[PDB]
Design a protein around this ligand. Structure first.
Ligand SMILES: [Mg+2]
Ligand SMILES: [Mg+2]
Ligand SMILES: [Mg+2]
Ligand SMILES: [Mg+2]
Ligand SMILES: [Mg+2]
Ligand SMILES: [Mg+2]
Ligand SMILES: [Mg+2]
Ligand SMILES: [Mg+2]
Lengths: 93, 273, 87, 64, 131
RNA sequence: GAAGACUGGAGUGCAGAAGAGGAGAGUGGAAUUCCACGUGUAGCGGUGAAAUGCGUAGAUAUGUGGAGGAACACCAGUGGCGAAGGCGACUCUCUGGUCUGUAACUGACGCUGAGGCGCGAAAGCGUGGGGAGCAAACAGGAUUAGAUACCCUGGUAGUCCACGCCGUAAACGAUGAGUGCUAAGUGUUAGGGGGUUUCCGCCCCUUAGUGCUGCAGCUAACGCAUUAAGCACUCCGCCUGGGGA
RNA sequence: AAAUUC
């Protein structure tokens, strides 16, 4: 099947660390049963409402090819535990 | 959960008991066991002060860490055991230091999870932190009242408190009975509800099962003698022929408040139960 | 069942190259689906609406069986063994 | 009348095109009805799912 | 034609008679053949044509009306129903409308109207009344 | 009845479409209530009027944050889906059905279906969680000749979740399932096809649903009228004066 | 506001 990931990273992350979580977050998808087509970031974008005390944030877009589907669930489990990604949604394609 | 018993005999008609689905091992660590001797409510002088005690199955005390001052060292849950001295299960922890100690088993704690404590630990079940660092609204247990003394406020099975707000040097707390209280912000607590939540649904179902737990029969007052109880006497059955029901020592025993009216700790209690 | 899974099944039951509706090819697939759905209905036991679709399929399997059992008794007595059903 | 989608050649929907989607939202942030926007009946469901899924991920306000 | 394709055939005639139609077609069969020919022998039908098709062919029937707009076939009733079959002995074949009507009998020597079945002394299943 | 043949019925294959169909897990924002802390003063609330109630231990109001539960604003539409009860926040996993187009395949494999087995709103029951509102019972204030009620302030079971029972209703379209035939007009849902037409858009043909107006026919009348209560065939359930019941 | 019987 075809999936897609789009997650939000807190703006108060220095660009050294903000380039590290992407390798970490994209690490799991390739580690488990999935393949990533690309991983692009839109950049800073204002939020329509204050999701946390924050008001701004960073955006990301990822495409996948998976069949066992367990990679996505592993991605879901680490998403809430982590304190970096605030909102993330999985869409099927 | 709870294991009901088929009505074989009249003594087994209603008895129910816990099935112990959660205890992992049944061999205590021999290095953390201290002897106990029953006292049966017998006093310093050998007199009997608190009655209806004594004469049960023998036990063995087993030391428990109520302080959790070992800070920053990862601890791992080794097992969940049965402890006869209390209403909650306990867990055996072996830190990477090599030391072993017991802690109270909070609800949701399972073998394998790792426990930190101190001033840099995260917010998860089993972690120990000062009330200073605890975010408001969380559910805690094993509170303490003086800094460094050891956990003393919430300990029984399936009970919990709730951090309610910070007021400078002190922290507001809602205790299990519903009494909102104020305590020092440098005390400690453990996040999460206490484990054995079903301990209160058990039918004893037998007098013998009452006596297996160090309990002795209770005799009413209306069947005593006039010199034995303010109620005893009267031919046939007799009601409470007094102004108010009385304890065996005067001092009315229904609706009569007995807290010390001039206590030092009235100013730390926002509202009672 | 996926589409590709079925085309693997049909190739193991056809009489000639391209039949797709003979009773035995028609029943080889349905038995696979019935077995597949039971393992998906023995976990979520409260899906009452979807369980009815299982009843229709086993009802549609039995009606085809009596077709063979009155058309070619030899063929039907052979199909069961390969497919591992009962009477 | 006349559906913009059914006319202007836009067939698919992507929940990233926030600027394009903003034409179909009111001043207070509510979804416009069909009788005023003129969209076709079929694409209305495509649009309604599109806005909601975006409205969760902070691209558009819930109440403005 | 779910169960009885003769009961249906009679009905298809009666419905198109009520609305004053002129032509009507329907799938053909050996039994439907002569039952449509008999009605031609008494003028109940203007004429009949057959059509060859891929499945079984059809039969096209030209219904007849008298001038001044008066119908010719004023009703039809079935007697041998699939739920209850009826058979009539030779002497007990009825007369419809005191002989003004016509009945259809499937005797042992081909489908036959009872004008001559009583003359030929045979009986069989009684298919329909026409009057 | 036996043997053989055929493809329209029925079913499979192939290409597409729509959907509050279902089970499980995870997640979201408004809003009522409560809690903590600022600002500030004597009322807030309520009725046909009034009182009970809450407030000077400082209310109602107002700003910031925390906690818990239940339902999902706009989209929303005699719109969609399901066999009937019923089904609206979002995402993912596991699943059921239906429709259109094709003519590749099987060749009557069909319909109904007593007893039997399942599903079945709400209330109710058992064991156990949970408990924001609302609210049987009940208390207080009112009304009235009386008021066990309607009106007002509170409030337990319940409403919610897991497992197991109950098996009822105006469970209604008060209309059993299946098949064929018998004028039109106009809406709307998902499709296919053609004309006009560079497109868009307009016009026409057709399938399956969903509304309304109306001939032939039916009915006691009201009304039904291609979604028949019209004309026919197969199978199932039920009725035989009212009460007693 | 409520406001019965013949
Ligand atoms: Mg005692
Ligand atoms: Mg005595
Ligand atoms: Mg006496
Ligand atoms: Mg006395
Ligand atoms: Mg029955
Ligand atoms: Mg209920
Ligand atoms: Mg009330
Ligand atoms: Mg229609």
């Amino acid at each position: 099947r075809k999936y897609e990931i789009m997650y939000i990273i807190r703006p108060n992350i220095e660009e050294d660390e903000k380039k590290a979580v992407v390798e970490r977050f994209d690490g799991i998808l390739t580690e488990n049963g999935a393949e990533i087509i690309e991983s692009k970031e839109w950049g800073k974008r204002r939020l329509a409402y204050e999701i946390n005390d924050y008001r701004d944030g960073f955006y990301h877009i990822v495409k996948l090819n998976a069949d066992k589907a367990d990679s996505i669930n592993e991605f879901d489990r680490l998403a809430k535990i982590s304190d970096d990604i605030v909102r993330h949604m999985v869409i099927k394609e | 959960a709870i294991k009901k018993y088929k009505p074989t005999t009249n003594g087994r008609r209603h008895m129910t008991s816990s099935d112990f689905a959660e205890i992992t091992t049944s061999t205590p660590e021999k290095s953390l066991l201290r002897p106990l001797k029953k006292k049966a409510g017998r006093n310093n002088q050998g007199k009997l002060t608190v009655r209806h005690h004594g004469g049960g199955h023998k036990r063995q005390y087993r030391v428990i860490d109520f302080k959790r001052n070992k800070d920053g060292i990862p601890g791992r849950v080794a097992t969940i055991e049965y402890d006869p001295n209390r209403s909650a299960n306990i867990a055996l922890i072996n830190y990477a230091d090599g030391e072993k100690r017991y802690i109270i088993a909070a609800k949701g704690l399972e073998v394998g999870q790792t426990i930190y404590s101190g001033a840099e630990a995260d917010i998860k079940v089993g972690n120990a932190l000062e009330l200073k660092d605890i975010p408001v609204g969380t559910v805690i247990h094993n509170i303490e009242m003086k800094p460094g003394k050891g956990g003393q406020l919430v300990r029984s099975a399936g009970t919990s408190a709730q951090v309610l707000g910070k007021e400078g040097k002190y922290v507001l707390i809602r205790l299990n009975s519903g009494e909102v209280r104020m305590i020092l912000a440098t005390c400690r607590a453990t996040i999460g509800q206490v484990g054995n939540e079903q301990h209160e649904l058990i039918n004893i179902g037998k007098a013998g099962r009452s006596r297996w737990m160090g309990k002795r029969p209770t005799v009413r007052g209306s069947v005593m003698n006039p010199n034995d109880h303010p109620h005893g006497g009267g031919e046939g059955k007799a009601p409470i022929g007094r102004k108010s029901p009385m304890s065996p020592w005067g001092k009315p025993t229904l609706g009569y408040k007995t807290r010390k009216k001039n206590n030092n700790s009235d100013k730390f209690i926002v509202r009672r139960r | 069942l996926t589409q590709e899974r079925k085309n693997e099944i049909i190739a193991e039951y056809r009489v000639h190259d391209t039949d797709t509706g003979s009773p035995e090819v028609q029943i080889a697939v349905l038995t696979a689906e019935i077995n597949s759905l039971n393992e998906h209905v023995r976990v979520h036991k409260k899906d009452h609406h979807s369980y009815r679709g299982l009843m229709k399929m086993v009802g549609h399997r039995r009606n085809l069986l009596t077709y063979l059992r009155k058309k070619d008794v030899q063929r039907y007595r052979e199909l069961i063994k390969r497919l591992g059903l009962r009477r | 009348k006349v559906c913009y989608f059914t006319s202007n050649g836009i067939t698919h929907i992507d929940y990233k095109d926030v600027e394009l989607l903003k034409k179909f939202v009111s001043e207070r942030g509510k979804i416009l009805p069909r009788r005023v926007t003129g969209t076709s009946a079929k694409y209305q469901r495509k649009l309604t799912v599109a806005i909601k899924r975006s409205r969760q991920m902070a691209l558009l306000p819930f109440v403005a | 034609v779910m169960t009885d394709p003769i009961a249906d055939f009679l009905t298809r005639i009666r419905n198109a008679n009520m609305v004053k139609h002129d032509k009507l077609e329907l799938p053909a069969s050996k039994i439907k053949k002569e039952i449509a020919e008999i009605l031609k022998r008494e003028g109940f039908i203007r004429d009949v044509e057959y059509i060859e098709d891929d499945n079984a062919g059809t039969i096209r029937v030209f219904l007849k009306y008298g001038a001044t707009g008066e119908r010719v076939i004023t009703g039809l009733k079935r007697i041998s129903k699939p739920g209850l079959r009826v058979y009539a002995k030779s002497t007990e074949v009825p007369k419809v409308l005191n002989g003004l009507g016509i009945a259809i009998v499937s005797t042992s020597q081909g489908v036959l109207t009872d004008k001559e079945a009583r003359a030929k002394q045979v009986g069989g299943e009684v298919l329909a009344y026409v009057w």
